[PDB]
Amino acid sequence: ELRVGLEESELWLRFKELTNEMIVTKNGRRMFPVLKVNVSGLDPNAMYSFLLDFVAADNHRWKYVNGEWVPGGKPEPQAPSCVYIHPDSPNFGAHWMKAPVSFSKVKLTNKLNGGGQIMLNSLHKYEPRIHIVRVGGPQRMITSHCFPETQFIAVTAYQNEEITALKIKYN
Numbered sequence: 001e002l003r004v005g006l007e008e009s010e011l012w013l014r015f016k017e018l019t020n021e022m023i024v025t026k027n028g029r030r031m032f033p034v035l036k037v038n039v040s041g042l043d044p045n046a047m048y049s050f051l052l053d054f055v056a057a058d059n060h061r062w063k064y065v066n067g068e069w070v071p072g073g074k075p076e077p078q079a080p081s082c083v084y085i086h087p088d089s090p091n092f093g094a095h096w097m098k099a100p101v102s103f104s105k106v107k108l109t110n111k112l113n114g115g116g117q118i119m120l121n122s123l124h125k126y127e128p129r130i131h132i133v134r135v136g137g138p139q140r141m142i143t144s145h146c147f148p149e150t151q152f153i154a155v156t157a158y159q160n161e162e163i164t165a166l167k168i169k170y171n
């Protein structure tokens, strides 16, 4: 059985208990913490691409009111985010299972951009998601996995100083 696990859930959980925030910029900003995933039960000889996208966790815009995050009243449909391809892709099952798969180079932006960067809607809450795509075989297959622990609100600057402090403490 193909097993997907979050590396450093310990640390992600400290961020989640405060409501995590991730900065988005015109040119794109790298994530901290970085999403790192442990995968077992791949065919070491089969070929795979690792894909990352972000699900809008609810249909609302969020605002930091009186030191607390609160959702707007006016939900809108949240279109699916674009997918980021892990730059090691495509690669053998053995490659992926030999060390945690680290999405260290994805950049989150608030603007439609050339390439690479993933555009998110500021003040929307997101749940990171990966897709493991078996490629090069005749039989294409996709396994998807969500990481609730890694939820965050996309922000142009930090609202909760407790997040600012944690970001610096563990970087």
Ligand SMILES: Cc1nc(CC(=O)N2CCOCC2)cs1
Pocket (backbone or CB within 6 Å): 080, 081, 082, 083, 084, 085
């Ligand atoms: C808005 C959406 N677009 C997609 C596809 C996508 O972004 N890809 C870029 C990198 O891999 C190839 C396809 C899924 S939802």
